[PDB]
Structures are given as C-alpha cells and as structure tokens.
Paper text:
Here we present rotamer inverted fragment finder–diffusion (Riff-Diff), a hybrid machine learning and atomistic modelling strategy for scaffolding catalytic arrays in de novo proteins. We highlight the general applicability of Riff-Diff by designing enzymes for two mechanistically distinct chemical transformations, the retro-aldol reaction and the Morita–Baylis–Hillman reaction. We show that in both cases, it is possible to generate catalysts that exhibit activities rivalling those optimized by in vitro evolution, along with exquisite stereoselectivity. High-resolution structures of six of the designs revealed near-atomic active site design precision.
Numbering used by the authors: 2 to 198
Write the structure that this text describes.
Amino acid sequence: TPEEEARAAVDSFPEALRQRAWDLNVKSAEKLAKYGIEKVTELALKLLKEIFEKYVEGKITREDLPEVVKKILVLLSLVKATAIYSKEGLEKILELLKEIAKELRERGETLLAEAIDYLIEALEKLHKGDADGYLTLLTIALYLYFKHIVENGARDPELAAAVRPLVEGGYEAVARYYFEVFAPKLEEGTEEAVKLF
C-alpha cells in the first residue's frame, strides 16, 4: 500500500533525524500557541482561502513564486499549531481543505487534490501525536505535489526539472528532501507568522 511503502521509506532514515523534525514541529507550535489558538486558527483560515482563490484564478505567475511559497510556509505553520493544540480549530481547517480538494478534483487537478487528501491525513496523525504516521503521510502529500508539478510542467519547465529527480526517486527521495531541506525551513514560516501578530 502507498502508506506502507512510504512508511517503510520513513523508517529507513535515522531516528535522530526524525526526532529532530518532530521536535522542530512542536517548538514551532508552542511559539505560535503563545499568540492564542483561536487567533492562530482564524489567521490560518483566512490565508488558506486567499491562496486557494488566487490559485484557481490563475493569478499565480512564475514571477509570483517566491511570495506564494512564503505564504504557504506561514499557512502550514499556523495549521500545524492548530493540529497540535485544538481539535475544534483543526476540524474547521480540515473541513475547508476537504472542500478545496473536492473543488480541485472537479477542476481536474487530481494529483494536487490527492496531495491535499494526504496532508489532511497527516494533520490528523499530528493531532494524535503520531510522529512517524505524520511523516509518512506528509511524504506522500509532498510526493503527489511534486508529481502534480511534473505533470503540469508546461507551466514552469525549470521548476518541473528541479523536482523531477525527487519524483523519479520515489518516497525515499521525497523523505530525504523533507528531512534535509524542508523541515529546517519551518522556522522561516514560523518567523513570518510571528510578524503577522
């Protein structure tokens, strides 16, 4: 099963590295939880809606890419804080993501919709405190996201070319990218979120 294979990929990496990623998520969540979980959730919902509305309208150009990544990093930091500390807030964020995934599927962005389904599942594992289950589902969500970029690479061929080795390398390559590149960037998202308050 995709979940079993991705999980196997996650377990092949050193425990210390996985523990670092987990500890980093929790520290970011505590930093954001200091600002009120209701406020964190409200901001998360606002940013999620903005990003989705802009995306569907095709107003994200290649020139726009650095700013959107920053907005996503903030959104993920806020959402993760909510997943750790508020079931009700989490339920609202998840409900919205399910609607977005359905809409994207109806629009034919099927891989992106699948990526979002797996993000939703990862957030539920995060809420339950399952670090390995979280990293497994997050790896699948990133893999599907990159696959979406490669299948749509006509929109940014260079970006497709950059992430293609990750797709060709499978869940192991995606997990490797996460541990070595993505997880350290979480702090960047947290800092931008702090600035918003």
